[PDB]
């Protein structure tokens, strides 16, 4: 009976600990579940005292409004939006810096789900400084605020080419070609994805992920028996090798032919697709790659591709192949976003 808007709204001014984090727990309950009940919710006019209520010091009271934001932050990029411009990132940033693993966890939780939206929304986070916070996290030894940490960088990351530029300028592509060697599978695939978006840049970004020695790891893991493993390399060396001819040369010199030639014989379809995609973007340049995958065998199994009964397979092997006759490319971005 009657709506639970106007009540929680109101005690979320009130100075009543306990009676302010009911309101908190009606919000949070509220905003977890349909995209229409989380805009209600806004237009209800929560959020000015949710960003207010973030720089509370009662800590309950600010985990209960970082778990109000992640359910928020878990809908419509407008939604979002409106959490930006209420300003709410400083107060983010500041609980980045916070000893309380619970609530660190929770920001980071944000902060990623936040970072992928619209490039103007990761202009704006960058912009509320979690870029120098993000990146000293990044030597965490917690798994859980690593894995977040390396999460969020991959979505700012996921941007325009000045988002991966100040990403870059963070200092963050030492720390993730360190961890391109972890034994932690899990890390690792994120390490390979924010990797992957930073290569999906401009050719100075994909020549500043070379400097930094990534390409001697990733054609060592081009033999891992981890076909997860194995497609998230292929993914980072196809964006490497969308860039101009002196970083597809650079990759030919890190070896990756002959792998990517045997890997062109594989029964799985979506490491032969991944494998086409990567030889795809290393016959997109110069006379002289094209004549060293000509020379590593490629056209034959090419042409034997092409009678695969796959269509998708056939078609791109087809067109490979005309790229490799013919005289002289795609770049893929990927997001995280999670909900509760
Ligand atoms: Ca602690
Ligand atoms: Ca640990
Ligand atoms: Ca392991
Ligand atoms: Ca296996
Ligand atoms: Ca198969």
Not at 10 to 16: G, R, T
Not at 93 to 113: G, K, T
Not at 224 to 249: C, D, K, M, R, V
Request: aromatic share 2%; proline share 4%.
């Amino acid at each position: 009976p009657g709506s639970e808007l106007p009540q929680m709204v109101q005690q979320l001014n009130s100075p009543d600990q306990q009676e302010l984090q009911s309101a908190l727990r009606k919000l949070s309950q509220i905003a977890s579940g349909g995209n229409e009940q989380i805009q209600a919710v806004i237009d209800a006019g929560a959020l000015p005292a949710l960003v207010q209520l973030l720089s509370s010091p009662n800590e309950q009271i600010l985990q209960e409004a970082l778990w109000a934001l992640s359910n928020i932050a878990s809908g419509g990029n407008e939604q979002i939006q409106a959490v930006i411009d209420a300003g709410a990132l400083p107060a983010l940033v500041q609980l980045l810096s916070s000893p309380n693993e619970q609530i660190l966890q929770e920001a980071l939780w944000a902060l990623r789900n936040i970072a992928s939206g619209g490039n103007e929304q990761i202009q704006a986070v960058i912009d509320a400084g979690a870029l120098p916070a993000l990146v000293q996290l990044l030597s965490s030894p917690n798994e859980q605020i690593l894995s977040s940490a390396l999460g969020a960088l991959s979505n700012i990351a996921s941007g325009g080419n000045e988002q991966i530029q100040a990403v870059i300028d963070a200092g963050a592509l030492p720390a993730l070609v360190q961890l391109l060697s972890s034994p932690n599978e899990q890390i690792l695939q994120l390490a390979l994805w924010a990797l992957s978006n930073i290569a999906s840049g401009g050719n100075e970004q994909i020549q500043a992920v070379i400097d930094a020695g990534a390409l001697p790891a990733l054609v060592q893991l081009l033999s891992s028996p981890n076909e997860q493993i194995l497609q998230e390399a292929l993914w980072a060396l196809s964006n490497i090798a969308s860039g101009g001819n002196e970083q597809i040369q650079a990759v030919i010199d890190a070896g990756a032919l002959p792998a990517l030639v045997q890997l062109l014989s594989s029964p799985n379809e979506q490491i032969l697709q991944e494998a086409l995609w990567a030889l795809s973007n290393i016959a997109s340049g110069g006379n002289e790659q094209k004549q060293a995958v000509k020379e590593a065998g490629a056209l034959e199994k090419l042409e034997q591709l092409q009678s695969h009964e796959n269509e998708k397979i056939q078609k791109e092997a087809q067109e490979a192949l005309e790229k490799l006759q013919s005289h002289g490319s795609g770049k893929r971005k990927r997001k995280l976003k999670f909900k509760r």
